Amino acid sequence: RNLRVLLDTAIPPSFCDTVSSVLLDDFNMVSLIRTSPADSLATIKQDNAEIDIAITIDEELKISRFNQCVLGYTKAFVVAHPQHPLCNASLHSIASLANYRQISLGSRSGQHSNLLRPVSDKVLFVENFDDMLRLVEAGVGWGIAPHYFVEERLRNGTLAVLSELYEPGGIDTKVYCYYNTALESERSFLRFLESARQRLRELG
Amino acid sequence: RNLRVLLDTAIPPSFCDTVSSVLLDDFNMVSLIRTSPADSLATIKQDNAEIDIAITIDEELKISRFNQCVLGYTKAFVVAHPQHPLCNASLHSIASLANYRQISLGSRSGQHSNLLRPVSDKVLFVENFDDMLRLVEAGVGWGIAPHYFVEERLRNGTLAVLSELYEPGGIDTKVYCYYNTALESERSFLRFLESARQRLRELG
Ligand SMILES: CC(C)Oc1ccc(-c2ncc(CNc3ccnc(C(F)(F)F)c3)cn2)cc1Cl
Ligand SMILES: CC(C)Oc1ccc(-c2ncc(CNc3ccnc(C(F)(F)F)c3)cn2)cc1Cl
């Protein structure tokens, strides 16, 4: 039968690399789908999408018709222009960053998870990290981005990090894997889980 | 828009690993499809399948509505049971292997490419390498298989190689990449080509 895997934008692509390497060996067709973390959960719930596996950071225990396991952790950072105001203060709190503009990830349904619910009251919603960064690089605000996006930008100084007194080394965020009940009865999935887990570990 | 990549069974899975790693970065949805090498070409020709990229070993310059490039080489071997008759003779020719039973890959359309057209006159068609090997291990005949299938079997002695005076180190077979004209105008594809090429090289 056909499979349809979903990976949110927070998960780096070299992960879907190793996901498809494994699943094809014991399948016919594997469809990889990318979505904003704000849209990931809402997508699988639609019975119309026939999503069989979802791999995202958003959290929910009330998801129905699916199950839930943990694959590992990804990494995120609070970034802002190097000359952005809050780099002068090595001691900026949540209530201090809530008074500036955040570049959040707006959802296509309007709902906002407790995960990606913006922190600031002055917010400017986007649908993807590429646009979140095009703004943050212009100094329009700050935002929380995956490590793989802000990796190059941080090394060459186009972009600085604000989240080091909060959590040194970046904000670790669980990657979860929702999966439809029927795949419980199958090896390859268990083989995929063990490989996906060892795959997210190697990214540290 | 949506993409649908096709990989034949002769190409190992860790290759579709690196194919999807690259394409997703600059796409929304990538669908990976596995097919017997005998069925690969016939599939893309069907305009009903909406195949956008095909990656197989079968050869044809008259393919219409597509283009054609070369990605690298895979490897194959002529294998047979270790106690199979033709291991006694270190000097078996094509006309000597044509008198025994071959386990070929039959096609769903009946047609047989000049590539996978069986060599022997006594042939037993299968649709996949797993069944080709279940027979060859039983000593029902010999067959031409990809390196990644007969890798473990050869190391632990469950299966021997007959194709070393023909071509030492295994029969190298070009992997090609057929691709629809519209993708000519795009970077990621050129980025995919250069990565897929360096990916098949690393498998040597
Ligand atoms: C420096 C300190 C004073 O400020 C902050 C520290 C931490 C947080 C913070 N909020 C939400 C979460 C939940 N997880 C994510 C939310 C959004 N996106 C992502 C990802 F980028 F991974 F996709 C992950 C994690 N951390 C917010 C602030 Cl403002
Ligand atoms: C030892 C010698 C005396 O015998 C032989 C030597 C070589 C050949 C031979 N024939 C066809 C081709 C074409 N390429 C493939 C055909 C089928 N399958 C595959 C793959 F496995 F890769 F998918 C590749 C290559 N080689 C046949 C014989 Cl009998």
Numbering used by the authors:
A (entry chain A), B (entry chain A): 93 to 296
Extract from the study:
A promising target for QS inhibitors (QSI) in PA is Pseudomonas quinolone signaling receptor (PqsR), also called multiple virulence factor regulator (MvfR). PqsR is a transcriptional regulator that controls the Pseudomonas quinolone signaling (PQS) system and is considered as one of the master regulators of PA virulence. Activation of PqsR by its native agonist PQS leads to the direct and indirect transcriptional modulation of genes responsible for environmental adaptation, virulence factor expression, iron acquisition, redox signaling, antibiotic tolerance, cytotoxicity, and immune modulation/evasion. Herein, this work reports the rational design, optimization, and in‐depth profiling of a new class of Pseudomonas quinolone signaling receptor (PqsR) inverse agonists.
We solved the crystal structure of 24 in complex with PqsR at a resolution of 2.74 Å. Notably, the detected electron density confirmed a more planar conformation of the bi‐aryl ring system in 24. Upon binding to PqsR, both rings tilted about 24° as observed by the corresponding dihedral angle. We conclude that the planar conformation promotes this space‐filling mode‐of‐interaction, rendering the pyrimidine scaffold beneficial for achieving high affinity. The binding mode to PqsR was elucidated by an X‐ray cocrystal structure.
